[PDB]
Amino acid sequence: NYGYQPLFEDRRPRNIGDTLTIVLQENVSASKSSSANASRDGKTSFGFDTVPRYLQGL
Amino acid sequence: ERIRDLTSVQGVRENSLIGYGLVVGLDGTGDQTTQTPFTTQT
């Protein structure tokens, strides 16, 4: 003799020892990224090609 | 006679029960099961 069993309810596991099907469908995906940058240029110049006489002292 | 018509007794009350079932034996006046899946499932 087994216990009371419902009629219209689905067959769910209810006690220790009942079986149940697992459908393994796992799909995980993670990601990350980053960056950084910096820059600097400089260029100076000056040239007195032909100096007049009254400025030759400087 | 009269007091029983005016009062109730503490601890003497009613409760409600609900359930799901199927009714068979209809003359073709049942569900159109193509739109009530729980009928065929149960």
Side-chain angles (χ1 to χ4, degrees):
Chain A
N1 174 28
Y2 313 139
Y4 157 77
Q5 300 155 228
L7 223 63
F8 311 108
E9 309 185 32
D10 292 284
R11 37 187 189 104
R12 293 171 178 176
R14 303 177 215 272
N15 299 280
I16 291 182
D18 288 291
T19 76
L20 156 75
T21 298
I22 308 281
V23 180
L24 311 158
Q25 42 172 217
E26 303 298 299
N27 185 291
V28 184
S29 162
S31 145
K32 80 187 185 181
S33 77
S34 63
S35 91
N37 72 84
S39 208
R40 191 167 81 172
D41 284 18
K43 170 160 46 61
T44 178
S45 144
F46 170 67
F48 222 136
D49 191 325
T50 302
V51 195
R53 187 166 300 172
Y54 61 96
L55 284 182
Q56 202 82 216
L58 285 99
Chain B
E1 202 57 54
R2 265 243 67 94
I3 287 192
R4 61 145 70 246
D5 275 318
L6 299 178
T7 69
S8 10
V9 185
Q10 181 208 35
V12 182
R13 48 162 299 174
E14 285 212 341
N15 300 263
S16 295
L17 316 178
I18 191 187
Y20 171 92
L22 278 181
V23 163
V24 289
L26 314 177
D27 275 279
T29 60
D31 294 2
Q32 288 121 1
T33 51
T34 106
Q35 285 153 139
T36 57
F38 47 93
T39 314
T40 52
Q41 173 169 341
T42 43

